[PDB]
């Protein structure tokens, strides 16, 4: 349970760096922008996750549908097994029925 | 985001301080000590 004996270098975060100061700037782009672009368009990330959300099962299911054929073998296989496991679990196990 | 318990040291000390004056291994080992302290109270 031994705890480090030396004070860590104090990390100084400047809150006024570019990325922090400009944060959430275009979030209202639809309302103020005479709706053309929905705020979804501002989402950077995985192709299957842009402007969408779901529990792990739905997530995997969707990843497979979208990018499934671009996947590496091991990863596709793992994805399938994951799906089968989650399917079995959510549908057949739990307290609440 | 992995979270580990950093302060576990003090968690242990708040038990062990009550056990110092016991005889045997009860005064050292958190397991035995926790039990003995509870019985003490």
């Amino acid at each position: 349970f031994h705890v480090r004996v030396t004070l860590p270098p104090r990390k100084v975060v400047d809150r006024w760096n570019e990325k922090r100061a400009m944060f959430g700037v275009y979030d209202n782009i639809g309302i103020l922008g005479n709706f053309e672009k929905h705020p979804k368009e501002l989402i950077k990330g995985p192709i299957w996750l842009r402007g969408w959300k779901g529990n792990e099962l739905q997530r995997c299911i969707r990843k497979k549908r979208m990018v499934g054929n671009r996947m590496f073998i091991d990863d596709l296989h793992n994805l399938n097994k994951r799906i089968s496991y989650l399917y079995k679990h959510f549908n057949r196990h739990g307290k609440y029925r | 985001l992995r979270s580990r318990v950093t302060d576990r040291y003090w968690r242990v000390q708040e038990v062990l301080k009550h056990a110092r004056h016991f005889r045997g291994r009860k005064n050292r080992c958190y397991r035995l000590a926790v039990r003995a302290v509870t019985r003490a109270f």
Partner: peptide
């Protein structure tokens, strides 16, 4: 290694206490 200031600081206090227990200041 565990990431945080808090426990380190809090321990620095203990170090000081022991230092004062082993050599008491005049």
């Amino acid at each position: 290694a565990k990431k945080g200031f808090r426990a380190a600081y809090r321990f620095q206090k203990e170090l000081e206490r022991w230092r004062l227990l082993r050599c008491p200041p005049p």
